[PDB]
Structure 1
Amino acid sequence: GSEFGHRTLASTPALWASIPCPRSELRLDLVLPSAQSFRWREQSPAHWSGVLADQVWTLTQTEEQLHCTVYRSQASRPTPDELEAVRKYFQLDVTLAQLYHHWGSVDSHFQEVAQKFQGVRLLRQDPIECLFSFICSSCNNIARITGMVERLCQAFGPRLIQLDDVTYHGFPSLQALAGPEVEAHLRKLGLGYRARYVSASARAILEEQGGLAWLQQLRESSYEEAHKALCILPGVGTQVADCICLMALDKPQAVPVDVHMWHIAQRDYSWHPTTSQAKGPSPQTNKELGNFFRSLWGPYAGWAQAVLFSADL
């Protein structure tokens, strides 16, 4: 009975396991729907379900605990090894209290604004999902992006399991996305011109860059190196590259500059371009603005930016 549908902490207590984690270090309601990953849904109030480490999970938290439950057979509580995967996904080793202190210490503005928005951290995402999810972010809003990514995974990703009327799918592989007629197919799913970038980048990686390995090892390369490489892919400009660097390649100093960030820079810092004579967003002015926040916040400027983006809603 309760053995069907998405679980909740109450309905199947013996199936959940917890990870010590204070809400000051993580607010699911601030991270999961914030445009880092687009594959988490709050199917039950305060409960988020999505694919993590190739399996489906539901997560919910109390004041000091991050409660997790996994759907693989034979119903059972998450093993310690599995829970680890959750910890790594949320990079729980990176201490938020420490980062907030540092940023608050060097930025009076961050100071005030951050008090009301604690728990905003960066998800450690898979390079492929992050690469194609953000290729779909172009001239698009979170709601539409979520739909496109969803249709995309349903059509080309492996079927995992079914909860209620939701069939979860793993993210498509490079082979799948590189397949014949993927573009036309993606266009039917509404991805528009982005359909072409998805197809083109899948093939470029597989047939020109050396495949998945080329991408995966960027995590060991330098931020400037990683950012440089990523920009080779079609549909991947400096902005989506920074997103990938920050979100999947362990480059915490990466700062994706979009119009949103410009608004923050102008309104909350009275910032203006020093180098370029261009007064608005341009390849040159965007690069600079990114440098501005890096010198202000430090080695984790990217994480700091996420905090401001949350409080800005």
Structure 2
Amino acid sequence: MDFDMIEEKKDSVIVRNVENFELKDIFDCGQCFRWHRQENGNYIGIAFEKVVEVQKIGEDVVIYNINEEEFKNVWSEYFDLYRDYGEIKKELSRDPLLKKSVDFGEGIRILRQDPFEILLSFIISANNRIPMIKKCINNISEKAGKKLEYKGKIYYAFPTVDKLHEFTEKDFEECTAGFRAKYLKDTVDRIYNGELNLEYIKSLNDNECHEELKKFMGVGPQVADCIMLFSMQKYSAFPVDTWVKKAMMSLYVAPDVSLKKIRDFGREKFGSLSGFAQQYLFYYARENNIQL
């Protein structure tokens, strides 16, 4: 594990000697939308119908609003704290071309998020901008999510499948999903009616899992890779957007080809570490706003 032990406190849990764990790297590397940076450096987020605040002090991490039982069954896995990222980075850094990206995002960890929330979140992410995506997801939660309180503030859990089934295309449109409102509604019904089952989809191997997810309206190859990587731990995924495409052409002189071919080229080169590889690539590419 990438931590030595924990210690339960009054209203929190302290993780001792965490390794490969930085707040900005984890929360701003592109994998999540409901974690917000606070004035003091901490981050507050809403996941699994719960509000959590995370802080790093030295080599320790404090997770407020949770107990040891919650840490053991929910959060330790949420933060993928059982996987050794030192090995991942060591293996990838063998490629001198990846070192710079890996070192820049050294504290990245791929969270184990909820499939349903992730499915709708990334359908919303397609050709969108960060602000609109976050706004839309929050709007959907405020409108139909369980109300929550933390330190004098109200927050909204992500809505259940049943509550969202009540939504009309117009509702998603009012939350500003734009033309994607149609995809959200179509997708929620497929979930509700039982046509597509997320937990079953998640039990399939990387390639099968991927194919199924593409059955959802608004879900193409890129979005499918994001969904299975971020919520179904299918590590051979290699999400290709314009940022990953740039970093890829720039480093391996890959010629301008389809996203599918860039995806095939990435997965071929990184295998089981493809997902981790693209996150480092993506994070570095976007924060440094690289060009041809």
Return the TM-score normalized by structure 2.
Answer: 0.89
After superposition, the CA RMSD in angstroms is: 1.7
Q: 1:179 aligns with which of 162, 166, 186?
A: 166
Q: Which residue of structure 2 lines up, in the alignment, with residue 5 of structure 1?
A: none
Establish whether residue 202 from structure 1 lines up as the match of residue 175 from structure 2.
no
How far apart, CA to CA, are the structure 1 residues paired with 2:224 and 2:88? 24
Read off the aligned partner of 1:222 and give its amino acid letter: N
2:115·2:227 contact (CA, 8 Å) conserved in 1?
Answer: yes
Establish whether residue 49 from structure 1 lines up as the match of residue 37 from structure 2.
no
1:18·1:65 contact (CA, 8 Å) conserved in 2?
Answer: yes
1:125-161 deviation digits (Å, cap 9, x = unpaired): 1000000000100111112211111111111211122
Establish whether residue 100 from structure 1 lines up as the match of residue 100 from structure 2.
no
Q: Give the match's secondary structure for 1:122.
A: coil
Q: 1:35 aligns with which of 30, 36, 43?
A: 30
Establish whether residue 19 from structure 1 lines up as the match of residue 15 from structure 2.
yes
Q: Give the match's secondary structure for 1:54.
A: coil
Q: 1:142 aligns with which of 126, 130, 140?
A: 130
Quote how far apart the aligned CAs of 1:21 are: 4.2
Establish whether residue 308 from structure 1 lines up as the match of residue 281 from structure 2.
yes
Matches within 5 A, 1:271-290: 271-272=254-255, 279-280=256-257, 285-290=258-263
Distance 1:162 1:116, change over 3 A: closer
Return 185-194 or 251-260, whichever deviates more: 185-194
Quote how far apart the aligned CAs of 1:175 are: 1.6
Q: Which residue of structure 1 lines up, in the alignment, with residue 70 of structure 2?
A: 82
Q: 1:59 aligns with which of 51, 54, 59?
A: 54
Establish whether residue 125 from structure 1 lines up as the match of residue 113 from structure 2.
yes
**Bigger radius of gyration, 1 or 2?**
1
Identity level (%)? 26
How far apart, CA to CA, are the structure 1 residues paired with 2:278 and 2:189? 32
Q: Which residue of structure 2 lines up, in the alignment, with residue 189 of structure 1?
A: 175
Quote how far apart the aligned CAs of 1:16 are: 3.1
Quote how far apart the aligned CAs of 1:55 are: 1.7
Distance 1:187 1:180, change over 3 A: closer
Unmatched runs of 5 consecutive residues or more in structure 2:
1-8, 288-292
Quote how far apart the aligned CAs of 1:208 are: 4.8
How far apart, CA to CA, are the structure 2 residues paired with 1:28 and 1:176? 32
Q: Which residue of structure 1 lines up, in the alignment, with residue 251 of structure 2?
A: 268
How far apart, CA to CA, are the structure 2 residues paired with 1:32 and 1:117? 11
Q: Give the match's secondary structure for 1:59.
A: strand
1:135·1:194 contact (CA, 8 Å) conserved in 2?
Answer: yes
How far apart, CA to CA, are the structure 2 residues paired with 1:124 and 1:21? 21
How far apart, CA to CA, are the structure 1 residues paired with 2:32 and 2:88? 22
Read off the aligned partner of 1:54 and give its amino acid letter: E
Quote how far apart the aligned CAs of 1:14 are: 4.5
Matches within 5 A, 1:224-235: 224-235=207-218
How far apart, CA to CA, are the structure 1 residues paired with 2:17 and 2:276? 18
Q: Give the match's secondary structure for 2:178.
A: coil
Q: Which residue of structure 1 lines up, in the alignment, with residue 3 of structure 2?
A: none
How far apart, CA to CA, are the structure 1 residues paired with 2:16 and 2:274? 26
Q: 2:268 aligns with which of 280, 295, 310?
A: 295
1:52·1:86 contact (CA, 8 Å) conserved in 2?
Answer: no
Read off the aligned partner of 1:243 and give its amino acid letter: C
Unmatched runs of 5 consecutive residues or more in structure 1:
1-12, 71-77, 273-278
Distance 1:20 1:187, change over 3 A: same
How far apart, CA to CA, are the structure 2 residues paired with 1:60 and 1:152? 27
2:12·2:67 contact (CA, 8 Å) conserved in 1?
Answer: no
